[PDB]
Design a binder for this molecule. Structure first.
Ligand SMILES: [Mn+2]
Ligand SMILES: [Mn+2]
Ligand SMILES: [Mn+2]
Ligand SMILES: [Mn+2]
Lengths: 306, 306, 306, 306
């Protein structure tokens, strides 16, 4: 069976917040319907024995602090409630009330120490505040002290040129640009050097890292005093998206084999498309049987048992 | 010997315009010194028998139309003058007075029909106007009627988040994001379908195309009614930059073998670094002798003799 | 009776374009319902004998050139058709297919030379191209040759800070910032100096000009070689909006008495609110009866008979 | 004698930070030279008996937290050291390490409770975080508990349209747009309602408030549940800049007579230009002798002795 490290859920209060604050479709991508039953049924039909639920983007920062704290709490309560309802099928990563540092520090401690979260999920940027920002140092310290799993999830870039790619859904190119920019932001701030105990999961096979690393390697070594290649060995990656036949293969010459995790990205990625993507990973000639076994189960299992 | 399809020159008026309008280093990258002799000497020391000179970025659109037209003309006159001075070593691609459509139409006709340009070079975006924009249709029509070579050159993206990758030179990540966004912009506007005779050269081994194509293939097929894979076979690519060991190999499963062109990117890329990059292409185990021969000379030669 | 120089209409194709391209309420302001009868009945109920209709913002530039040209033509045909159906009650200002210079040049000649337009209306900025930009020189020349009336209409600023005034409707502060930025842009490019024959109507009592003029006066004189105070005497101003008791009075110490035009801004401003604004201009102690007569009728009439 | 509530100083570390992080002239305005003697000699030559020094913009947030905290501490030590060296001529407002909430909370307590600060000065926005943002609630609470004076100082707007007013110095229009956006932001978050004890000084005669208030009055009442006119009576205003003959007079129909404070804005505004602006306030026919006395001394004095 497989363990899904990139699968989502949508609390009712979160769905109401989207309709209330976002005109049209969020990220130029229509909000998908969802119920625990949808995920469970998908797990049954695709031999997934365990899913680590996480709140997707847009992040719940709409400009109202009390609202953001309320949404994050509701979302975490749902995650926790589902973990207690299906202890063998569902687990969850806690969302944080970013950009509110002290409040996020409080959520980290509470979600990890008492509410059974397996770790946390954080937006590449929340209305402009990109992860890696020293505005959240105390949050990093609380996460590092707990050797926590930190899964990044791409959000629409804070700002982009308006007269280009007009109406191109944000997930198609924006998400990748943001994840890439965030990774680099983390290198600039010595994140992996200062918080070596955190286990960072970079989604969608590392976005554009497989191409820019080689291009920034020099600058990063000279100006950031960081070896991008060592970092690529240190972090983790989920493999949601069109990772075949080019993206994953390129990533494997940079990533550590034990650090690759399977992900479906349901329900934002239509269930059928997700099934097809997972079937591709199972039958491709680009992966050995050992690698398929690691990506689908062993890697996640090792990570979770630690 | 090799033919360089991505090498630059800097007219004195262009250097004066940069100091006058751009504070600090352009694109967060210090302006390099240059003289024809620098390029010629570099060609001698690296067995390059022919170079196709082109004006790099930033584009010469500073908000003053008459100035832009004056700079573009001066630049083209320099290119032409060098072609007549060293008919066997130097050739040139004309710059255009974008965003001024009718004026650019006039430059295209004049540079190609009477001043010996081998084609044109255009910015991915000129102060926000991204290539592919219907604002320049008449320019495309004049270029298509002449089966012209059109080389894109990345410019700093019109706008980006300000609190991320602070002070990261633009060429390291911005250039790639822009070239990628522009390519997609061209797909949205059916550029290759409407102007099938133009020979578009996409720089730096296609930036991020090797990773996003697979991700947008579906949307592009359904909404743009375009097959991104056919397009990748139709266009050309230069191979300047850290194309090894991941970028070029990925691109070769998408690009046509005869459409890959060598490029050094001097003098913006230090001459020594450029020499090292070219030496890598010559000794790598990732390319057959036939491929090295095609990339370094045959492909460009075929393209130029047409 | 009064003459209304700032009143709007909404072609059905324009309304369908808004629903199709703009998510939610355009400019954060709900699109109003409209038919020719609503304007006409408003005119009878408010002693308005003549209205010069114009298309409001957002401008019809959605990224599709053919569509922009089609929408503009449909809007001008409607304006023309209304002037022919109600010669004594309705007139109109033609819209222009900006940012397409050559096409706009064509619309100006046609609109003014044969379609009966009383002049043109233009957006302070169309997706980033601000009026005054040399990208439209040929358009200015065609307008100056006809001593045309050019009425600016504010649009949402191209871009603004993301985390401030969240959800504040655009017309409340954005429109003013845009009109203000556009006027200065026109100073910078010597618009009034180069096209003295054009009669420019700046909406909403000059937005912030009443306050910034004194601040930029020096710079404009030294760097633009322009006397802002002379320009304020040269252009025109409609007085739609909350012009009393502060805005209009300030503007009158800078504007010429004969260059002040009445405006209601229906139907974007609720009809009852517009009736109240008009009633206030009629009964205020801040204006002499002569000024009320000039603003409501004489100034417009003189400009129209010219 | 007069009391100056808008005058600046430049710590050496701040000057070095500007050269190191800002290319060209900050805010498009050349950094002025300064020593304590320049301010003091200006005071003797212009009948100023007391100046409340403050750090001008750009704010010291360059992306490095430790550096921001270090720069703020160096600036406050200088301010404190000047107040101790010239108890009768110089006082100071402390800067805050915004956007670091907890750290700023610390600076407020220390600055006001033991370092002799007369209050604090804050940027309308620090790299995108606009004052009034709930990200700084704890900072407001610490300030309200001390009935602290909080002086806003405009900074370049986070982002603006790229192709308009090209090269127009930021202080000429940008500063005003920012102060204006910030004031409304504060309305939106019920700042004055929640922190009634803070005495907010809005610079440059309220920027554009004199004109927008009447336009947003309705929306602010209905959506923010705030009466903008009551707020205008509640806050304070310095009168640096070209306040005559239009700006200041408009502001006086909204502001409380006792809440108007004199300001020179040296050394950013050339000393001769500031002397002329002060002389104009002294000889203008737009103010009674009582108002001139209040603006120049009484109002400040009453606020300081409180
Ligand atoms: Mn996802
Ligand atoms: Mn180049
Ligand atoms: Mn209007
Ligand atoms: Mn100041």
């Amino acid at each position: 069976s497989k363990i899904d490290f990139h699968t989502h859920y949508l609390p009712t209060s979160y769905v109401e917040a989207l309709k209330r604050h976002v005109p049209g479709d969020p990220d130029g991508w229509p909000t998908p319907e969802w119920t625990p039953q949808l995920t469970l049924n998908f797990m049954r039909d695709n031999d997934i024995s365990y899913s680590i639920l996480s709140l997707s983007s847009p992040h719940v920062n709409f400009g109202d602090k009390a609202e953001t704290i309320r949404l994050v709490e509701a979302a975490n309560d749902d995650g926790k409630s589902l973990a207690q309802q299906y202890p063998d099928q569902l687990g969850y990563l806690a969302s944080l009330p970013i950009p509110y540092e002290l409040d996020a520090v409080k959520t980290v401690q509470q979600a990890l120490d008492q509410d059974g979260a397996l770790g946390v999920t954080v937006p590449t940027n929340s209305r402009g505040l990109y992860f890696g920002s020293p505005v959240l140092e105390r949050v990093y310290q609380e996460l590092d002290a707990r050797q926590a799993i930190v899964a990044l999830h791409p959000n629409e870039p804070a700002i982009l040129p308006k007269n280009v790619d007009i109406d191109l859904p944000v997930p198609l190119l924006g998400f990748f640009m943001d994840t890439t920019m965030t990774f680099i932001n983390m290198l600039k701030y010595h994140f992996f050097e200062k918080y070596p105990n955190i286990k960072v999961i970079i989604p969608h096979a590392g976005a554009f890292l497989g191409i820019v690393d080689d291009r920034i390697a020099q600058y990063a070594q000279k100006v950031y005093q960081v070896d991008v290649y060592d970092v690529m060995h240190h972090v983790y990656f989920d493999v949601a998206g069109a990772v075949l036949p080019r993206q994953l293969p390129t990533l494997m010459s940079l990533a550590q084999p034990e650090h690759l995790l399977y992900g479906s990205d349901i329900p934002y990625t239509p269930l059928d498309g997700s099934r097809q993507l997972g079937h591709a990973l199972a039958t491709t000639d680009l992966l050995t049987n050992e690698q398929k076994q690691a990506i689908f189960y062993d890697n996640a299992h090792r990570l979770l048992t630690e």
